[PDB]
Amino acid sequence: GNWATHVYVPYEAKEEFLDLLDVLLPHAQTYVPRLVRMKVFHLSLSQSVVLRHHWILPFVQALKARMTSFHRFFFTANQVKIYTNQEKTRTFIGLEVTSGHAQFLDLVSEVDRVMEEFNLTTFYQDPSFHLSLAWCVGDARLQLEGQCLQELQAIVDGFEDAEVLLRVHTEQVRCKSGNKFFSMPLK
Ligand SMILES: [Cl-]
């Protein structure tokens, strides 16, 4: 049996963050009505890979052993960007990491060690770490890039308390494998 497996950093949404999203999302919906709010928020550390069932618990053990030694850190995510998935069947509005990118690279280096320990694919060669806020079916880049994006950025740039996005504090690493989740604290 083959289980889809993904490693990521959850984001624990501040109440301010959810108010920001309450303003951003309707604005974006004036361009693309079918956008869907994310229910939970994360920054990916891995590709979606496949693990045989037998190896899920050992993989999680190995991941926990490396992650729990890695220290919590702060990052900035205040740059709005438009993402698609590789097939262009989904479009995302996200917040791209600037300050703190170095720490995410170090985290990925550790995840990638675990991936190699299990014969799994290591992370994208040119990553842009990001927090996805909303998504839609299809390829909506044309509608969202340009004027909409500039307007979303102005909502972000005018947001108060700006510290919510300037100093986002990582807590934990999570893995989803099939229908199962596994979480672990950063040090
Ligand atoms: Cl639509």
Side-chain angles (χ1 to χ4, degrees):
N2 296 316
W3 284 54
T5 303
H6 182 212
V7 184
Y8 57 91
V9 177
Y11 170 58
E12 291 74 60
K14 292 181 163 182
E15 281 294 334
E16 303 77 357
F17 180 89
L18 296 176
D19 282 358
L20 172 61
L21 189 49
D22 289 343
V23 177
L24 293 171
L25 182 59
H27 188 100
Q29 288 172 324
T30 71
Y31 295 85
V32 181
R34 70 181 183 278
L35 285 160
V36 183
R37 190 186 186 110
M38 294 292 179
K39 294 180 177 269
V40 287
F41 308 92
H42 72 275
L43 306 92
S44 182
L45 302 174
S46 79
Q47 305 202 38
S48 179
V49 302
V50 158
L51 262 176
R52 285 186 203 179
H53 181 272
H54 180 79
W55 296 119
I56 292 163
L57 292 182
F59 175 88
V60 172
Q61 184 182 298
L63 185 65
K64 285 192 174 183
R66 306 287 177 181
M67 293 302 95
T68 57
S69 290
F70 194 101
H71 287 72
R72 299 153 45 217
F73 62 92
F74 291 90
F75 67 94
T76 302
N78 64 15
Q79 303 301 117
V80 188
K81 297 296 176 185
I82 307 307
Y83 300 90
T84 66
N85 63 3
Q86 287 308 101
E87 297 178 346
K88 310 252 185 316
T89 61
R90 296 281 177 276
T91 303
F92 303 86
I93 302 173
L95 299 170
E96 185 179 41
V97 174
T98 50
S99 181
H101 179 101
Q103 287 289 348
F104 279 102
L105 289 179
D106 263 12
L107 194 54
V108 167
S109 287
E110 294 291 310
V111 176
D112 281 347
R113 287 180 75 197
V114 180
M115 287 302 197
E116 293 196 24
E117 285 168 0
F118 285 77
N119 311 110
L120 303 169
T121 309
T122 59
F123 199 47
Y124 309 97
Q125 277 316 83
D126 177 21
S128 165
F129 297 95
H130 62 278
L131 270 179
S132 296
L133 305 184
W135 64 275
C136 60
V137 161
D139 181 357
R141 292 175 290 166
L142 279 186
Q143 304 104 107
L144 297 171
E145 287 185 332
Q147 183 187 335
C148 178
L149 184 60
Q150 291 163 37
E151 293 166 351
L152 298 177
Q153 188 65 55
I155 293 162
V156 173
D157 288 349
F159 187 69
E160 303 165 285
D161 189 341
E163 294 305 318
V164 170
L165 301 179
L166 283 165
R167 294 272 289 186
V168 188
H169 197 184
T170 65
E171 187 91 47
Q172 69 184 303
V173 171
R174 188 168 294 164
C175 175
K176 185 184 187 180
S177 188
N179 69 320
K180 299 162 183 255
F181 297 89
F182 307 89
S183 300
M184 63 216 71
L186 292 170
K187 184 177 190 182

